[PDB]
From Swiss-Prot, chain A:
Record's subunit section: Component of the IFT complex A (IFT-A) complex. IFT-A complex is divided into a core subcomplex composed of IFT122:IFT140:WDR19 which is associated with TULP3 and a peripheral subcomplex composed of IFT43:WDR35:TTC21B. Interacts (via C-terminal region) with IFT122 (via C-terminal region). Interacts with BBS1. Interacts with TTC25.
Protein name listed in UniProt: WD repeat-containing protein 19
Included stretch of the parent chain: 680 to 789 of 1342
Gene for this chain: WDR19
TPR repeats: 57-90
Induction comment from the UniProt entry of this chain: By androgenic hormones. Expression increased 3-fold in an androgen-stimulated androgen-sensitive prostate adenocarcinoma cell line compared with androgen-deprived cells.
From Swiss-Prot, chain B:
Ranges: TPR repeats: 73-108, 110-138, 159-192
Function noted in UniProt: Component of the IFT complex A (IFT-A), a complex required for retrograde ciliary transport and entry into cilia of G protein-coupled receptors (GPCRs). Plays a pivotal role in proper development and function of ciliated cells through its role in ciliogenesis and/or cilium maintenance. Required for the development and maintenance of the outer segments of rod and cone photoreceptor cells. Plays a role in maintenance and the delivery of opsin to the outer segment of photoreceptor cells.
Annotated disorder: Short-rib thoracic dysplasia 9 with or without polydactyly: A form of short-rib thoracic dysplasia, a group of autosomal recessive ciliopathies that are characterized by a constricted thoracic cage, short ribs, shortened tubular bones, and a 'trident' appearance of the acetabular roof. Polydactyly is variably present. Non-skeletal involvement can include cleft lip/palate as well as anomalies of major organs such as the brain, eye, heart, kidneys, liver, pancreas, intestines, and genitalia.
Quaternary data: Component of the IFT complex A (IFT-A). IFT-A complex is divided into a core subcomplex composed of IFT122:IFT140:WDR19 which is associated with TULP3 and a peripheral subcomplex composed of IFT43:WDR35:TTC21B. Interacts (via C-terminal region) with IFT122 (via C-terminal region). Interacts with TTC25. Interacts with TTC21A.
Subcellular location: Cytoplasm, Cytoskeleton, Cilium basal body; Cytoplasm, Cytoskeleton, Microtubule organizing center, Centrosome; Cell projection, Cilium
Protein known as: Intraflagellar transport protein 140 homolog
Result after altering residue 75 to C: In RP80; uncertain significance
Organism: Homo sapiens (Human)
UniProtKB/Swiss-Prot annotation, chain C:
Range of the intact protein held here: 802 to 1241 of 1241
Expression sites (tissue/organ): Expressed in many tissues. Predominant expression in testis and pituitary.
Top-level taxon of the source organism: Eukaryota
Function comment: As a component of the IFT complex A (IFT-A), a complex required for retrograde ciliary transport and entry into cilia of G protein-coupled receptors (GPCRs), it is required in ciliogenesis and ciliary protein trafficking. Involved in cilia formation during neuronal patterning. Acts as a negative regulator of Shh signaling. Required to recruit TULP3 to primary cilia.
Location relative to the cell: Cell projection, Cilium; Cytoplasm, Cytoskeleton, Cilium basal body
Associated disorder: Cranioectodermal dysplasia 1: A disorder characterized by craniofacial, skeletal and ectodermal abnormalities. Clinical features include dolichocephaly (with or without sagittal suture synostosis), scaphocephaly, short stature, limb shortening, short ribs, narrow chest, brachydactyly, renal failure and hepatic fibrosis, small and abnormally shaped teeth, sparse hair, skin laxity and abnormal nails.
Domain comment (free text): Forms the trimeric core subcomplex IFT122:IFT140:WDR19 via the C-terminal region, whereas it interacts with IFT43:WDR35 via the N-terminal region containing the WD repeats.
Transmembrane segments: none
Protein's UniProt name: Intraflagellar transport protein 122 homolog
Length: 110, 227, 392
């Protein structure tokens, strides 16, 4: 609850300390990568991603200096329809690559 | 047919043992673990499959397998970052002293920052000194406790700390104490600058003549030119 | 020559008696090049070892790896040794690790110096035609990073210290220079919040109250650390009481077209009218009354110097032979870059305001500031070289 509150209140340095006490090394390494981000919307987007709030994370990434992080997040979650809809507006050159990876998943799904 | 997150987690753990990262990306996606999928994409810049699998093992909490994989790759740099992230600072320092000497100062600095955040200033001082960053991190950390900073400056007897403390005293208007510490620091330029600012140009000229310092002589020449 | 035991006993006594040239002659009479190389490495006759390594390339690694490691254990010497080994990529990788460590340690002045050294290595590597364009791109990238970290160090020191060594106008200029020079992707360890906070504070002190409001409005779009929040809120409440104008004395004049330019420009480091790049003093970051110019086609750099020395009693500025003859050597500054870069020529439009350039890093300064900084530090503040070095 303290860790989640530190993420909601954007206190990344305190969240690192709390997750290091919890022993969640994976979250600590990921927070150490984001610690230097000063863009409020980009940082809030990554922290929303870490709290599993992907719709708020997408809206914040679209309002940030790097909208492409929304596409990357949706690609990583395998939400291919949303990733393709984002790619149409933000990066048309990535559509074919996203479509190949989606097609491999669809070919496995039958 | 199985939508259960716990099964996709157990499969991601078995993907560490089988080293199959293609299936791990899918597992992380289906469990919603966006962070682990991102960490794997970033790890694709590393050429070593075992290092990429150690990143997956770190994201899943398999710390023993992650440690064994990093040791197997001989990448003591990622092992050091891992030990810092695990809070195992003593093992991080041991690895840095024996195998990753290039990061040893950075590890001492990060550990000193962690000790400072833990309110243990006395150990933080020693590791800021070992990292050679005390010249700015200590005056910062002790800026709220000026008596301890004065005692520390007088203990270390370092020209740059005496200059910093003299510049602090100068900002507070305590010029006689500033001159004393600038004399300890042998900073004949700052001595002449202060004596010129006080209007004691003859004492500035005596210092410039006796020390032979080119910068102090140049500054005094500019003052005489302005006069 | 049949008396091998007596001859080897003579060779080993000549070695034991620190006489490696006659031990070497004895080993050469016996045909033993392996003992000869070990004899030179053990007697530390590096010049003779290097001469053997040039005659027999198979020993280069056996001479230079022990040497580079010894220089690293005693990193600057390690880099010179990786350079001498021909392994330019490993030399760059070691220096990139040290830059990242310096940034992580907040040693931004050392980071700036190492980024300048990385830039010069990239220029040395760019002498190979197969990597010219990519390594020239990396050269400009690392040169720009060296200048960004050199400026940011002063701001960082101001924010962390309870006092300023630097003049308010210097910190104002540095903050403006950094905001103009910062890409959309902020380089590691650099803080936009610190740069905008110093700009807001110094803009208030200097009477640039619209720029101060703009800096506070830009700060509201960024995540603010808890230690600065009270000061930034108080500053935002304070600036609302001030007039809505900026001091005319702060406004950057373009010396080429005599246009007054806005205090922040969305076009990075250029005039809004003529698009001439601003040239900044590496001490004070004031704009320098210099205009960059280019030689007419068919004049060599050696010919251009000879015409400038023979004094008779975006659109680029291109200069003919007769104009070069009319120009005084006092007014023209020349950057003598190494080979796949042409020499760059700059004209001072205010001859009374003396400008000086470092002969090694080619950074430009007010002469009185450069003289003072060199006399204080014993060296150029940017490249740490003493006045004894006239070379690039």
């Amino acid at each position: 609850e303290l860790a989640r509150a530190c993420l909601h209140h954007m206190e990344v340095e305190f969240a690192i300390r709390v997750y290091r006490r919890i022993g969640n090394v994976g979250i600590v390494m990921s927070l150490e990568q984001i610690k230097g981000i000063e863009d409020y919307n980009l940082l809030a987007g990554h922290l929303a991603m870490f709290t599993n709030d992907y719709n708020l994370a997408q809206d914040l990434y679209l309002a940030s200096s790097c909208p492409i992080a929304a596409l990357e997040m949706r690609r990583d979650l395998q939400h291919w329809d949303s990733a393709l809809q984002l790619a149409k507006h933000l990066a048309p050159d990535q559509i074919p690559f996203i479509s190949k990876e989606y097609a491999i998943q669809l070919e496995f799904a039958g | 047919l199985i939508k259960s997150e716990a099964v996709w987690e157990n499969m991601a753990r078995m993907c560490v043992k089988t080293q199959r990262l293609d299936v791990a990306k899918v597992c992380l996606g289906n469990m919603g673990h966006a962070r682990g999928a991102r960490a794997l994409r970033e790890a694709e810049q590393e050429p070593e499959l075992e290092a990429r699998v150690a990143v997956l093992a770190t994201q899943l909490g398999m710390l023993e397998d992650a440690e064994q994989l990093y040791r197997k790759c001989k990448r003591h740099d990622l092992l050091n970052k891992f030990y810092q992230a695990a809070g195992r600072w003593q093992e991080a320092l041991q690895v840095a002293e024996h195998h990753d000497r290039v990061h040893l100062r950075s590890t001492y600095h990060r550990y000193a920052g962690h000790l400072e955040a833990s309110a243990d200033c006395s150990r933080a001082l020693s590791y800021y000194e070992k990292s050679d960053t005390h010249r700015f991190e200590v005056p910062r950390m002790l800026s709220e406790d000026l008596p301890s900073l004065e005692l520390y400056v007088n203990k270390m007897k370092d020209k740059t700390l005496w200059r910093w403390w003299a510049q602090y005293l100068e900002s507070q208007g305590e010029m006689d104490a500033a001159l004393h510490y600038y004399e300890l620091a042998r900073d004949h330029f700052s001595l002449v600058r202060i004596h010129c600012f006080q209007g004691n140009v003859q004492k500035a000229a005596q210092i410039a003549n006796e020390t032979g310092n080119l910068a102090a002589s140049y500054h005094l020449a500019r003052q005489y030119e302005s006069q | 020559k049949a008396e091998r035991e007596p001859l080897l006993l003579c060779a080993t006594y000549l070695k034991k008696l620190d006489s490696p040239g006659y031990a070497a002659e004895t080993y050469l009479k016996m045909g033993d090049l392996k003992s000869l190389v070990q004899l030179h490495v053990e007697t530390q006759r590096w010049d003779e070892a290097f001469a053997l390594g040039e005659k027999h390339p198979e020993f280069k690694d056996d001479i230079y790896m022990p040497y580079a490691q010894w220089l690293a254990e005693n990193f600057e010497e390690a880099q010179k040794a990786f350079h001498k080994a021909g392994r330019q990529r490993e030399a760059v990788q070691v220096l990139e690790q040290l830059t990242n460590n310096a940034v992580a340690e907040s040693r931004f002045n050392d980071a700036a110096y190492y980024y300048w050294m990385l830039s010069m290595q990239c220029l040395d590597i760019a002498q190979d035609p197969a990597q010219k364009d990519t390594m020239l791109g990396k050269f400009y990238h690392f040169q720009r990073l060296a200048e960004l970290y050199h400026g940011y160090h002063a701001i960082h020191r101001h924010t962390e210290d309870p006092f300023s060594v630097h003049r308010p106008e210097t910190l104002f200029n540095i903050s403006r220079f950094l905001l103009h020079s910062l890409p959309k992707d902020t380089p590691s360890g650099i803080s936009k919040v610190k740069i905008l906070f110093t700009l807001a504070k110094q803009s208030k002190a200097l009477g640039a109250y619209r720029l101060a409001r703009h800096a506070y409005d830009k700060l509201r779009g960024l995540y603010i650390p808890a230690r600065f929040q009270k000061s930034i809120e108080l500053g935002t409440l304070t600036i609302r009481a001030k007039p809505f104008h900026d001091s005319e004395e702060l406004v950057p004049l373009c010396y080429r077209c005599s246009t007054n330019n806005p205090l922040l420009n969305n076009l990075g480091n250029v005039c809004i009218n003529c698009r001439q790049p601003f040239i900044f003093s590496a001490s004070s970051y004031d704009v320098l009354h210099l205009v960059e110019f280019y030689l007419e086609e068919g004049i060599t750099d050696e010919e251009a110097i000879s015409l400038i020395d023979l004094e008779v009693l975006f659109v680029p500025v291109v200069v003919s032979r007769l104009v070069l003859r009319s120009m005084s050597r006092r007014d023209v500054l020349i950057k003598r870059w190494p080979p796949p870069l042409r020499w760059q020529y700059f004209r001072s439009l205010l001859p009374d305001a003396s400008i000086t350039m470092c002969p090694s890093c080619f950074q430009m300064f007010h002469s009185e500031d450069y003289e003072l900084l060199v006399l204080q530090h014993g060296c150029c503040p940017y490249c740490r070289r003493c006045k004894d070095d006239p070379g690039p």
